[PDB]
Design a protein around this ligand. Structure first.
Ligand SMILES: CC(=O)N1CCC[C@](O)(C(=O)O)C1
Ligand SMILES: [Zn+2]
Ligand SMILES: [Zn+2]
Ligand SMILES: [Zn+2]
Length: 585
């Protein structure tokens, strides 16, 4: 028994073809089964024919005869059909309201999540369907990981290098950081974990969580977890107040945080607030400063990634009493300078998926572009707070969508929070970039921030752009542009100071080739998000939707503190770069 995800109507029916098995009311369960291929219906029991060796599960072909269920062929003389009168049969038959359209729930229940349209709907549908879609997608995501073949260590060529043998008649996952494996040792009568791992083409390179002397017969699977059901909404109901509520501002504040005093008062004057923090505008400075402005306030700092939480811990270590901070870790190497797993500490730093059930004066949820509606609901379900602050930049990168192939996902569709920030705008905006030379601020201000991002620094005069298509080669799941690496190699012979540069590209294989030929440290745009370097060399590599995604480009070129060389493929973004042009040698 439970609640009808379309009506709320109390019901004893869940669709058994739906991977989540959502409770549906007589009217909603019926309208669902007759308009789609879903025909298995679950109650206190499953509406299946209880006859001996009969394979009827379709609820439109089944009858209640006695207190058992039968098809047409096996039914007793006295029966009624399970599924007639525009309704399906269970408990609470007389309480049931229905819907004028069931169209959105059917599409959510039946899509394979390969089309952008599927994510657009999951983000514009009613709130209760946002949860259903968030669960349904995540389960589809964790199941798709099972479809991948096991990889087995056939030979240990060296340290940090292997020869893999792959399961037959199953696809092989891409070998990039977005696919984290889990090793396993071959025991008497089972298997035991041996750290998480990643792989990249050579034989294969492997960068594992822990070090070992792993040997033949050891194997690797992408560990998938149980997806729990969602109760709480993605955003609580908004409330605007006329005074600061439940929070007592400080009388003395330092000139370090004085620029955020207006913004921190806004935080106290509404239930939830969005802060768009572009690159190097001071998001974590803002987050920690909130603690100093409201000194007695209990604050849970949360983000999706360990990295994101740890960076909040680093900043907190510089400004807040260590004895008042705690890092929550579930029983990967993260921050270890606070007492571990102390829920009742004033300042609690913890990933979304590890949150305890607790209350707080303020909740800060950082790197919000990376959040899914699933994460949004979980936080609302674990944390009951006087105030909620969402910090991020919908102009930066989202959580990768492993199933998406048709269409681009626009930032207004990354999650409920990014949708608000792109439709009504963000409550607060950090308008001054401290990190990047002016040529780079001017470029991304126009490109994705509506000319509202201002440069601290001056022109560096060390921002260059070269238009060079070169030659694109493809391997199993990535792109390589060797002539673009060549152009960079020639550039470093004539400009050897740039040998301190980080190499960035949109492709892990480009990076692996660039690492051999150049010896620069390498990052995917996607791994570079939240890091800064004095000097950045960027090869676009292709003109795909992937290498031209304006959020990706935004992150690529805002990594640079001093200078950047951009070797471009796309005539569009090249022409948008407010950088010095260089001829091809
Ligand atoms: C769609 C696409 O081409 N991608 C996103 C996933 C990683 C990637 O395959 C790579 O790093 O090679 C690039
Ligand atoms: Zn269904
Ligand atoms: Zn219903
Ligand atoms: Zn039967």
């Amino acid at each position: 028994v439970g609640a009808c995800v379309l009506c709320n109507s109390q019901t004893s029916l869940r669709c058994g073809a739906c991977i989540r098995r959502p409770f549906l009311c007589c009217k909603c369960c019926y309208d669902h089964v007759i308009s789609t291929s879903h025909k298995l219906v679950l109650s206190v029991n499953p509406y299946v024919c209880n006859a001996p060796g009969c394979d009827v599960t379709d609820v439109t072909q089944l009858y209640l005869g006695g207190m058992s269920y039968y098809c047409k062929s096996h039914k007793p003389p006295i029966s009624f059909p399970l599924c007639a009168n525009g309704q399906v049969f269970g408990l609470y038959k007389n309480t049931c309201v229905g819907s004028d359209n069931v169209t959105d729930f059917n599409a959510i229940a039946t899509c394979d999540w390969t089309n952008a349209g599927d994510y657009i709907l999951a983000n514009t549908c009613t709130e209760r369907l946002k949860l259903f879609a968030a669960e349904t997608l995540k389960a589809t995501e964790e199941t798709f990981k099972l479809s991948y073949g096991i990889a087995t260590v056939r030979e240990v060529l060296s340290d940090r290098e292997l020869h893999l043998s792959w399961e037959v008649g199953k696809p092989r996952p891409p070998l990039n950081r977005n696919y984290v494996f889990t090793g396993y040792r071959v025991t008497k009568n089972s298997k035991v974990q041996i750290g998480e791992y990643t792989f990249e083409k050579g034989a294969v390179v492997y960068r594992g969580t822990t070090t070992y002397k792993l040997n033949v017969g050891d194997y690797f699977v992408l560990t998938s977890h149980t997806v729990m059901p969602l109760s709480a909404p993605t955003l609580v109901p908004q409330e605007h107040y006329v005074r600061i509520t439940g929070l007592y501002p400080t009388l003395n504040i330092s000139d370090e945080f004085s620029s955020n005093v207006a913004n921190y008062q806004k935080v106290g004057m509404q239930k939830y607030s969005t802060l768009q923090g572009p690159p190097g505008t001071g998001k974590s400075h803002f987050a920690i400063g909130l603690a100093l402005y409201y000194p007695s306030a209990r604050i849970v700092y949360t983000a999706c990634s360990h990295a994101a939480v740890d960076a909040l811990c680093e900043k907190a270590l510089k400004y807040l009493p260590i004895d008042k901070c705690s890092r929550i870790i579930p029983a990967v190497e993260c921050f270890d300078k606070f007492k571990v797993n102390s829920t009742l500490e004033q300042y609690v730093f913890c990933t979304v998926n590890a949150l305890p059930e607790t209350t707080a004066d303020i909740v800060v949820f950082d790197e919000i572009s990376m959040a899914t509606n699933y994460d949004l609901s979980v936080v609302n379900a674990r944390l009951r707070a006087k105030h909620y602050v969402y910090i991020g930049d919908p102009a930066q990168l989202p959580a990768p969508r492993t199933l998406l192939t048709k269409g681009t996902l626009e930032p207004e569709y990354f999650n409920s929070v990014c949708r608000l920030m792109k439709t009504i705008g963000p409550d607060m905006f950090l308008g001054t970039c401290r990190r990047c030379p002016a040529e780079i601020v001017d470029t991304v201000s126009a490109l994705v921030y509506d000319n509202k991002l201002k440069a601290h620094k001056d022109k560096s005069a060390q921002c260059f752009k070269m238009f060079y298509k070169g030659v694109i080669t493809h391997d199993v799941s990535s792109a390589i542009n060797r002539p673009q690496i060549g152009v960079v190699r020639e550039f470093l012979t004539r400009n050897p100071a740039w040998r301190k540069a980080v190499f960035i590209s949109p492709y892990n294989s480009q990076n692996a080739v660039a690492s051999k030929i150049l010896g620069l440290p390498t990052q995917t745009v996607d791994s570079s998000q939240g890091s800064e370097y004095d000097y950045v060399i960027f090869t676009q590599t292709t003109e795909t939707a992937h290498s031209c995604n304006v959020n990706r480009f935004n992150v690529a070129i805002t990594r640079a503190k001093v200078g950047i060389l951009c070797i471009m493929s796309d005539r569009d973004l090249y022409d948008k770069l407010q950088f010095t042009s260089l001829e091809i040698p």
